[PDB]
């Protein structure tokens, strides 16, 4: 492949200089590097709580009090998840429910003063950033600026 990303042997990047037949081959490999809810969404889906349950069961009664105590508290959350109710991949957010409209009114006060539930200024926050995000990806994407926004976006969602 041309001069960006190409994996041949253990060495994994390939630059090209058609001057002399020179196939520059840089050596680092597929390093799955992620940051943000993206990385955690992944992590969360991959876990088979049954395995960690059993794993903790053994960690709980067998080693000394320091690592087994941590395992008891970590077995609490995992148990309920499995027990009854719903499964843990949902804690991550990719779909934000919007509160009804009439509950976040827009009203005519006096003089034509208007009155709206503070919720709407926060909603616009999220929407504008979410949108600006989409257009920022599409337009082309310089890393720093994409994160920069994803940061703001997150904060907004809070």
């Amino acid at each position: 492949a041309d001069g960006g990303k190409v994996k041949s042997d253990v060495y994994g990047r390939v630059e090209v200089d058609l001057v002399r037949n020179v196939v520059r081959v840089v050596e680092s490999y597929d390093i799955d590097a992620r940051m943000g809810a993206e990385a955690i969404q992944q992590l969360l889906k991959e876990l088979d709580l049954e395995a960690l349950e059993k794993e903790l069961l053994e960690e709980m009664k067998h080693p000394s009090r320091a690592r087994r105590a941590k395992a008891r508290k970590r077995l609490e959350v995992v148990r309920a998840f499995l027990d009854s109710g719903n499964r843990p991949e949902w804690m991550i957010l990719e779909a934000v429910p919007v509160l009804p409209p009439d509950l976040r009114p827009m009203v005519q006060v006096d003089g034509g003063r208007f009155a709206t539930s503070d919720l709407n200024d926060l909603y616009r926050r999220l929407i504008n950033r979410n949108n600006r995000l989409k257009k920022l990806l599409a337009q082309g994407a310089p890393e720093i600026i994409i994160r920069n926004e994803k940061r703001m976006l997150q904060e907004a969602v809070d």
């Binding site: 804690m91 957010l93 429910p97 919007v98 509160l99 509950l103």
Partner: peptide, 11 residues
């Protein structure tokens, strides 16, 4: 109902 929805507003 106000509650449930308020609650739905959050995950």
């Amino acid at each position: 109902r106000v509650l449930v929805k308020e609650l739905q507003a959050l995950a």
